[PDB]
Amino acid sequence: SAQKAPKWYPSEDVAALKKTRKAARPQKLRASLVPGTVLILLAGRFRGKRVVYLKHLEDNTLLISGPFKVNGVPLRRVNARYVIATSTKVSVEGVNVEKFNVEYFAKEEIKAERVEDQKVVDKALIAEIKKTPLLKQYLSASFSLKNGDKPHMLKF
Amino acid sequence: AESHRLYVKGKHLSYQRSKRVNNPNVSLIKIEGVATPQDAQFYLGKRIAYVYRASKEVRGSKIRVMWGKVTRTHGNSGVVRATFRNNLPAKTFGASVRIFLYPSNI
Amino acid sequence: LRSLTTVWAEHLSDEVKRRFYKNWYKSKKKAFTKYSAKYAQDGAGIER
Amino acid sequence: VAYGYPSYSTIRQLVYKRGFGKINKQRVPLSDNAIIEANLGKYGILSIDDLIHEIITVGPHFKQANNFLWPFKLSNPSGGWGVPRKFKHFIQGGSFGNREEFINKLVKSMN
Amino acid sequence: ASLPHPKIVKKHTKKFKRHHSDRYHRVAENWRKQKGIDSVVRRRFRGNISQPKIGYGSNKKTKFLSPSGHKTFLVANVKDLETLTMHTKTYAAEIAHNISAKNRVVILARAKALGIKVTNPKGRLAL
Amino acid sequence: VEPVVVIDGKGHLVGRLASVVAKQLLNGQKIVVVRAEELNISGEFFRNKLKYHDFLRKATAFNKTRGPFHFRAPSRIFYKALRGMVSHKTARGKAALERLKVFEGIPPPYDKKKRVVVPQALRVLRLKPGRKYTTLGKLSTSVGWKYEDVVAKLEAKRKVSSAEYYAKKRAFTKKVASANATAAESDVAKQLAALGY
Amino acid sequence: ARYGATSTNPAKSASARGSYLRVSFKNTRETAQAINGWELTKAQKYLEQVLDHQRAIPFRRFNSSIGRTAQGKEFGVTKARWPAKSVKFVQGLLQNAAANAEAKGLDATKLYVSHIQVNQAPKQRRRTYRAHGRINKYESSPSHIELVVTEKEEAVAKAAEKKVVRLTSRQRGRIAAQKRIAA
RNA sequence: UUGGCGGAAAGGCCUUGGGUGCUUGCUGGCGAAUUGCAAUGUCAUUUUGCGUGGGGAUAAAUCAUUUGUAUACGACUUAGA
RNA sequence: UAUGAUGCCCUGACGAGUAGGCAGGCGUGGAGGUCAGUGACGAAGCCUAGACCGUAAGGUCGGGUCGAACGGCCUCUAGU
RNA sequence: UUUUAGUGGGCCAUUUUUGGUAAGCAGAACUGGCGAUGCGGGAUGAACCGAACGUAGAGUUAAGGUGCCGGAAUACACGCU
């Protein structure tokens, strides 16, 4: 016995956690995000793509659409904190965004239902975007800073 | 576009120091184009990444990144105290450094 | 006063040809051959 | 020392935030009412508002209630001191001395 | 596996070398206190080597534990391994340095039966 | 916000320029100072001449060589005045002093590029009018800078070679100004004047 | 019969030792560094000329207060010298190692000295007699020499490991997003 | 490609004339998702080496020898098909 | 029942230090008991910008060298 | 209440103070330090200013500062030189 066995042994029993007092409570959004807002994406593959905001999903994320006919952005989730909200808006009424949920995006080419829902949304949104001048060119444009851009001076 | 930049560029200055002791756990960032502390209250929490190259390729890249964030203001001329996950190597005094816009508050 | 150019003459004698070698006997004596080729024309490089 | 006349507000904020009781010495927080009750119900005091009332209206039992509190472990002041040098008198533009009503301001930066 | 333990915090990881153990060969590296009067290590000037003292001591839950969350425990023979049958996921067996090659395989085969982690299973192996 | 900043030296106080130049080097901006010989020091000529002759008696006794070296040219007077600010013994200081190039006059690689000034260093914003100042060219020529006449000759070159340039710029902008005259009153000019441009 | 640190194939290596040689240590080391890493035939033609004072062994480490000379210009060093006795006790070992190569059947045209070292032997104590009735030591510094020569060989081609890469899902999400552009 | 200008560290600047590529000056069509809620998401510059391809040229210095205008020793200065 | 009461747990205050005092431990040679301990299928020692534990004295392991004895623990002892 | 170690060479400073032309001299008084003590400040400096130290994190401060060295206003206001 090259080490003398100890008398007291610590228990191998795990213990139950205390009844924690943290209720789940929903996100109080900042007021610059209203359905219809043209947004700017700061991260992901679609960085700097000007995009069209849609229904606030219930995993505290933001379902957005491109529309994909313009810039190349699908229906997608984007978190709220990674997004610069521009001031300019579009009308969103008439678009049945309220089908989708968290279950819709499921990690496992494209499942064809996604492209079908893309066309169904984007035809109404293109019919909305044609109503305002120069906006269809604007959403296709990427966003980046120039020299002498001071993003505290800049407004959105 | 010819310009693809989504980050406000900035310089690195010395560490947090007195005359004769320096604290490596806090770095100082000089953001271009900021004057007051009130004009630097916008950059609070915006996440800083130092982007530097290397020689050996690891994980499919030669470019390595040290992440961190702005914690608070510093001085009257808009200098900024910023900490990192692992601190900047003190060779990079007067190196460029990136201050992203995410986490956006706007 | 920085020197901008130098121009050497055409047929250097064997003494200034000997100044440029530490070892005149072994050498091919080839100093100022390719420079003396600049007189094959009218000297337009030399007049330049 | 720097001393002065505390009003109701600074006394209230101190007794709520930094107010600690002396119970066999044992500096014990004043989070609960019945701590104050079980120590000072002999003296009529049975809440923390009874403490603040026996402080600012110096009552029959100021000694025991004031002795029930631990000394207030205050912070450094929030906005600096207002002087370059502390150790001149307050009348000479320093810090120490009777600064009566201004002590309110200073304790609210040290709370 | 191990018990849920907090993340192991190791206040000062660096080995406390004796002052001037680098400068002289006759000075060992082992920590011995400089007790002189003109000292700067006892006198604790800045920029000089940190001395061990009781604040450096580690947490009572995570004391003696490896990264694997287990108190290492030397085991010589099989019959003394069998006192870890009840308490497996707290201690970890470690075979002593002088157990020969015909008994290390015996201890490992018994430990694999009773399910005890061995910190050095590769000791004295013939490939 | 440029890669290289070229600072005009004419009408700049040695110390007040040298301090901000030595601050920007230690933040990583390549600075090249041109025309350093028309730089200015406050106080009159004889004051600064005596300040220089105090510095010009301080060599090491046992060997005059390895002492303080007394550089005469105004580029190197400003260089001396600047490396007294940059902590120049550590590696960071040697790296910072490599970011600085200081010239007498305006050299060929730098006269086609636009030259800036430093407003917290210009002697015409700083000195109270009526004090004396000191032209650094006069000072250096007095203490052994053999070259000022030669420098002046070259400036008497390049101003001429620049003056024609300015004419060959200025008339052109006139034409552009004329086009900017005829681009008014259109719809696009009205829409830009609505949007602030 | 052990040797120094040799990284070479013993199957093409012939060696000679010669321990306990009474030479200077600080001259045998330096002739062993003048010889080191050359072809054996260039060394054997070289150490013949050192006795002729034609070319000189360059003293590099044990070199203080040596009279400088011209011939060390070959090797870049001003302090060179002609240690003849170390050269005889080295070139004896070179012809011994060449004979060991010829007995091993190694082709002598490609031999090069791949490992030579000398180090210190037990010293030979005598004594000398100083002023005011003193005795101080007077010792030789004899030398264990050893050398290993080896045939040089090419085909040393440097194919290396596989180096499996572990790039992330959103990194291969870009790498696969560029075969869909061109390739 | 045309010509002129620039030596303070010219090595740059302007210009004649075609040719080719783009054009968001304006109006159209199609693609761009799956990097799956972000992770620099690698697109700059420098130095070297190995290869193929093409043009171009085909020497020196050092030791050893010798000299004495040099010389402690190196160095120096000489000479030698 | 199932474990240490010279334990486990709660609360609070505090923590510089030469000469010096006290306490708690680490290490070395030998003695008694004990682990029916380890060991030529290789002890002890030695080398090791290899690993783990303790705040630290120190412990433990892996590798190489090696060739015969040696270690943990409860106690005694000193030419420690 | 017992018992026992180590000291029995001291120095500095503000005010009080003796001798002395004085002194980084000699000698006293009350107090605080240094010896025995780290830290931030006085560029440095046993005793001066602050402030006394278990190991870490964050916040606020002291004394001292904010042209550059060096963290921090080439800030503001009135004058003088």
From Swiss-Prot, chain A:
Q: Which GO terms describe its molecular function?
A: RNA binding; structural constituent of ribosome
Chief location bin: cytoplasm
Q: Where in this protein does the record say N-acetylserine is found?
A: S1
Q: Name one GO cellular component term.
A: cytosol
The yes or no answer to whether the keyword Ubl conjugation is present is yes
Which residues carry the post-translational modification Phosphoserine, per the record? S11
- Which InterPro entries does the record cross-reference, listed alphabetically? 60S_ribosomal_eL6, Rib_uL2_dom2, Ribosomal_eL6_CS, Ribosomal_eL6_KOW, Translation_prot_SH3-like_sf
The UniProt entry, under PROSITE patterns, shows: RIBOSOMAL_L6E
Query: What keywords is this UniProt entry annotated with?
Result: Acetylation, Cytoplasm, Isopeptide bond, Phosphoprotein, Ribonucleoprotein, Ribosomal protein, Ubl conjugation
Gene3D superfamilies given for it? 2.30.30.30
Q: Where in the cell is it found?
A: Cytoplasm
Question: Quick check: keyword Cell cycle in the entry?
Answer: no
Q: How does it assemble?
A: Component of the large ribosomal subunit (LSU). Mature yeast ribosomes consist of a small (40S) and a large (60S) subunit. The 40S small subunit contains 1 molecule of ribosomal RNA (18S rRNA) and 33 different proteins (encoded by 57 genes). The large 60S subunit contains 3 rRNA molecules (25S, 5.8S and 5S rRNA) and 46 different proteins (encoded by 81 genes).
Q: Please share what else the UniProt entry notes about this protein.
A: Present with 37100 molecules/cell in log phase SD medium. There are 2 genes for eL6 in yeast.
The family classification in the record reads: Belongs to the eukaryotic ribosomal protein eL6 family.
Q: What is this protein called?
A: Large ribosomal subunit protein eL6A
From Swiss-Prot, chain C:
Q: Where is this cross-link: Glycyl lysine isopeptide (Lys-Gly) (interchain with G-Cter in ubiquitin)?
A: K38
Q: Using the record's annotations, give every residue carrying the modification Phosphothreonine.
A: T5
Its subcellular locations are: Cytoplasm
Null mutant phenotype reads: A mutant confers resistance to trichodermin, a trichotecene toxin produced by plant-pathogenic fungi.
Q: Remarks, anything else?
A: Present with 450 molecules/cell in log phase SD medium.
Identify its protein family: Belongs to the universal ribosomal protein uL3 family.
Question: What is its biological role?
Answer: Component of the ribosome, a large ribonucleoprotein complex responsible for the synthesis of proteins in the cell. The small ribosomal subunit (SSU) binds messenger RNAs (mRNAs) and translates the encoded message by selecting cognate aminoacyl-transfer RNA (tRNA) molecules. The large subunit (LSU) contains the ribosomal catalytic site termed the peptidyl transferase center (PTC), which catalyzes the formation of peptide bonds, thereby polymerizing the amino acids delivered by tRNAs into a polypeptide chain.
* Official protein name in the record: Large ribosomal subunit protein uL3
Query: Gene encoding this polypeptide?
Result: RPL3
From Swiss-Prot, chain D:
Q: What is stated as this protein's family in its record?
A: Belongs to the universal ribosomal protein uL30 family.
Subunit (UniProt): Component of the large ribosomal subunit (LSU). Mature yeast ribosomes consist of a small (40S) and a large (60S) subunit. The 40S small subunit contains 1 molecule of ribosomal RNA (18S rRNA) and 33 different proteins (encoded by 57 genes). The large 60S subunit contains 3 rRNA molecules (25S, 5.8S and 5S rRNA) and 46 different proteins (encoded by 81 genes).
Q: Which domain of life is it from?
A: Eukaryota
Query: Where in the full protein does the shown chain start and end, and how long is the full protein?
Result: 134 to 244 of 244
- Task of the protein: Component of the ribosome, a large ribonucleoprotein complex responsible for the synthesis of proteins in the cell. The small ribosomal subunit (SSU) binds messenger RNAs (mRNAs) and translates the encoded message by selecting cognate aminoacyl-transfer RNA (tRNA) molecules. The large subunit (LSU) contains the ribosomal catalytic site termed the peptidyl transferase center (PTC), which catalyzes the formation of peptide bonds, thereby polymerizing the amino acids delivered by tRNAs into a polypeptide chain.
| Source species of the chain | Saccharomyces cerevisiae (strain ATCC 204508 / S288c)
Its protein name is: Large ribosomal subunit protein uL30A
Subcellular localization: Cytoplasm
Q: What else is known?
A: Present with 101000 molecules/cell in log phase SD medium. There are 2 genes for uL30 in yeast.
Swiss-Prot record, chain E:
PROSITE patterns linked: RIBOSOMAL_L32E (PS00580)
Answer yes or no on keyword Transit peptide: no
Q: Which residues carry this modification: Phosphoserine?
A: S39
Q: Which InterPro entries match?
A: Ribosomal_eL32, Ribosomal_eL32_CS, Ribosomal_eL32_sf
Per UniProt, the keywords (alphabetical) are: Cytoplasm, Phosphoprotein, Ribonucleoprotein, Ribosomal protein
Q: Name one GO biological process term.
A: cytoplasmic translation
Provide the GO MF annotations for this entry: structural constituent of ribosome
The UniProt entry, under SUPFAM superfamilies, shows: Ribosomal protein L32e
Please tell me one Gene Ontology term that the record gives under cellular component.
Answer: cytosol
Subcellular location, record wording: Cytoplasm
Please give the family membership noted in the entry: Belongs to the eukaryotic ribosomal protein eL32 family.
Q: How does it assemble?
A: Component of the large ribosomal subunit (LSU). Mature yeast ribosomes consist of a small (40S) and a large (60S) subunit. The 40S small subunit contains 1 molecule of ribosomal RNA (18S rRNA) and 33 different proteins (encoded by 57 genes). The large 60S subunit contains 3 rRNA molecules (25S, 5.8S and 5S rRNA) and 46 different proteins (encoded by 81 genes).
According to its UniProt entry, what is the function of this protein?
Component of the ribosome, a large ribonucleoprotein complex responsible for the synthesis of proteins in the cell. The small ribosomal subunit (SSU) binds messenger RNAs (mRNAs) and translates the encoded message by selecting cognate aminoacyl-transfer RNA (tRNA) molecules. The large subunit (LSU) contains the ribosomal catalytic site termed the peptidyl transferase center (PTC), which catalyzes the formation of peptide bonds, thereby polymerizing the amino acids delivered by tRNAs into a polypeptide chain.
Name of the protein in question? Large ribosomal subunit protein eL32
Gene that specifies this protein: RPL32
